[PDB]
Amino acid sequence: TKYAEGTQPFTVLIEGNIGSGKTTYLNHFEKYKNDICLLTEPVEKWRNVNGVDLLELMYKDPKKWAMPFQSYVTLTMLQSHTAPTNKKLKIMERSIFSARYCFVENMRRNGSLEQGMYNTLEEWYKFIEESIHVQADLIIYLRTSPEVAYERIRQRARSEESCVPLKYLQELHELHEDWLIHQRRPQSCKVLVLDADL
Amino acid sequence: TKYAEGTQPFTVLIEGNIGSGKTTYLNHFEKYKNDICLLTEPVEKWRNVNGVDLLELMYKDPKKWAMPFQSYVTLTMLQSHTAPTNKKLKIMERSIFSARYCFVENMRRNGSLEQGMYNTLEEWYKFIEESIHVQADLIIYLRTSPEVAYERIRQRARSEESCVPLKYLQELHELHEDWLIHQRRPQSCKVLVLDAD
Numbered sequence: 001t002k003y004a005e006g007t008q009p010f011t012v013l014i015e016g017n018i019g020s021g022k023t024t025y026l027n028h029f030e031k032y033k034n035d036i037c038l039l040t041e042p043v044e045k046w047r048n049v050n051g052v053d054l055l056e057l058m059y060k061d062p063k064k065w066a067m068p069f070q071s072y073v074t075l076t077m078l079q080s081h082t083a084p085t086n087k088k089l090k091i092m093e094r095s096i097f098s099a100r101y102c103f104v105e106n107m108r109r110n111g112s113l114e115q116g117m118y119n120t121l122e123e124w125y126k127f128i129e130e131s132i133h134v135q136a137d138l139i140i141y142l143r144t145s146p147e148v149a150y151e152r153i154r155q156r157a158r159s160e161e162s163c164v165p166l167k168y169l170q171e172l173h174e175l176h177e178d179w180l181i182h183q184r185r186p187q188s189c190k191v192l193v194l195d196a197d198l
Numbered sequence: 199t200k201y202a203e204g205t206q207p208f209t210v211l212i213e214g215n216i217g218s219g220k221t222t223y224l225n226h227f228e229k230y231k232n233d234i235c236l237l238t239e240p241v242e243k244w245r246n247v248n249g250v251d252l253l254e255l256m257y258k259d260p261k262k263w264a265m266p267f268q269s270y271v272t273l274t275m276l277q278s279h280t281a282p283t284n285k286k287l288k289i290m291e292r293s294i295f296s297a298r299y300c301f302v303e304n305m306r307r308n309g310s311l312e313q314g315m316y317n318t319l320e321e322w323y324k325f326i327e328e329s330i331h332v333q334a335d336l337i338i339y340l341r342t343s344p345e346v347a348y349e350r351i352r353q354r355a356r357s358e359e360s361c362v363p364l365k366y367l368q369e370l371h372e373l374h375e376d377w378l379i380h381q382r383r384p385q386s387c388k389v390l391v392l393d394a395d
């Protein structure tokens with residue numbers, strides 16, 4: 001019996017590249033706040049952990065900070081996935097799945113995570129599968145081109161994200177495609193693909 | 199309802215400094231293998247994670263490797279704390295508690311863990327308290343002097359541990375004392391103190 005088993009309503013995950021518009025999309029559900037559990041914009045936690053900007057440290061020094069940063073991302077997603085609610089619908093920006101299948105995998109490929117750091121994260125993910133219930137009924141994939149994602153990141157202008165290259169976004173895009181369209185990863189709930197290029 | 203709740207027998211944790219003799223002590227229960235769940239020498243996992251020696255990397259480059267290493271320690275302890283068994287007694291070398299109250303705290307104090315790494319580990323520990331059941335009925339504290347612990351480490355001669363100073367062992371000793379004798383940490387099951395000198 002997994003933690004949070006049987007405590008969760010129908011759950012929708014909003015996924016897509018950085019700057020694909022997940023938060024914007026989720027904001028359209030604001031008026032229904034009282035009948036839907038809405039968990040949006042988790043990046044605000046990652047930018048301020050008792051005053052420490054983990055997001056910033058990760059971009060400035062990935063070889064030292066990518067592992068604790070992804071570890072913290074995993075934790076916050078788990079807290080969101082398992083948060084109690086009386087509401088009959090839950091919608092979340094991101095999930096433990098994109099952290100694992102897109103970001104951790106890309107950080108392994110680009111050398112930010114050494115093999116031993118990657119293995120530690122993967123062993124944690126395997127333990128989480130066995131011990132924590134993660135309700136996932138539908139994924140909405142906000143599909144964009146990396147060039148469009150790049151412009152949205154620029155417009156928003158998070159200081160932490162000011163050095164993020166288009167190449168990084170191309171890499172992440174292919175990983176989201178692998179996972180959400182080509183089903184290359186053992187994640188099999190339903191996926192609705194939306195054209196988020198507008 | 200926490201994961202592993204109601205699946206665990208009476209559980210004993212063996213604690214003490216590096217080289218205090220926890221494994222040696224636990225080895226005396228070998229003949230009762232069939233009536234006791236014995237989980238010993240977890241360091242063997244930390245020295246070989248699909249071929250990677252995390253213990254070694256941590257000692258050689260703590261500022262980069264202390265966080266993933268402590269994260270992996272936490273995970274292996276959790277897997278041991280929650281492992282299923284039909285046996286009526288479980289005895290474990292170490293626990294998630296010593297990882298947290300002695301090693302992580304000492305790594306914070308000596309600068310191996312930056313504040314943000316320490317905060318990440320602590321936030322994980324707080325989530326684990328809320329979500330995972332950790333059976334702990336008795337702790338046996340193998341109390342030693344740091345000089346005696348130092349001798350045993352040198353005798354065993356793990357290559358990873360060849361640069362470990364006596365000062366480090368003095369620091370860890372005080373943390374084990376704080377936790378297991380002076381009750382400075384919010385951990386309150388029963389403690390039996392043994393003279394392991």
Ligand SMILES: Cc1cn([C@H]2C[C@H](O)[C@@H](COP(=O)(O)OP(=O)(O)OP(=O)(O)O)O2)c(=O)[nH]c1=O
Nearest residue numbers: 017018019020021022023024043073094099103
């Ligand atoms: C999920 C995740 C995000 N990040 C980073 C990428 C981003 O810089 C930041 C947040 O990314 P996103 O999770 O993509 O959030 P966002 O609000 O930027 O998305 P949108 O514009 O579509 O609303 O966190 C990681 O480094 N690792 C991860 O595991």
Ligand SMILES: Cc1cn([C@H]2C[C@H](O)[C@@H](COP(=O)(O)OP(=O)(O)OP(=O)(O)O)O2)c(=O)[nH]c1=O
Nearest residue numbers: 215216217218219220221222241271292297301
């Ligand atoms: C538990 C723990 C150990 N370590 C290190 C310390 C040691 O080098 C190594 C193992 O130490 P111990 O966990 O004390 O195991 P041991 O086998 O050395 O103990 P004994 O001789 O009493 O049987 O791992 C950490 O760095 N962090 C931790 O959280």
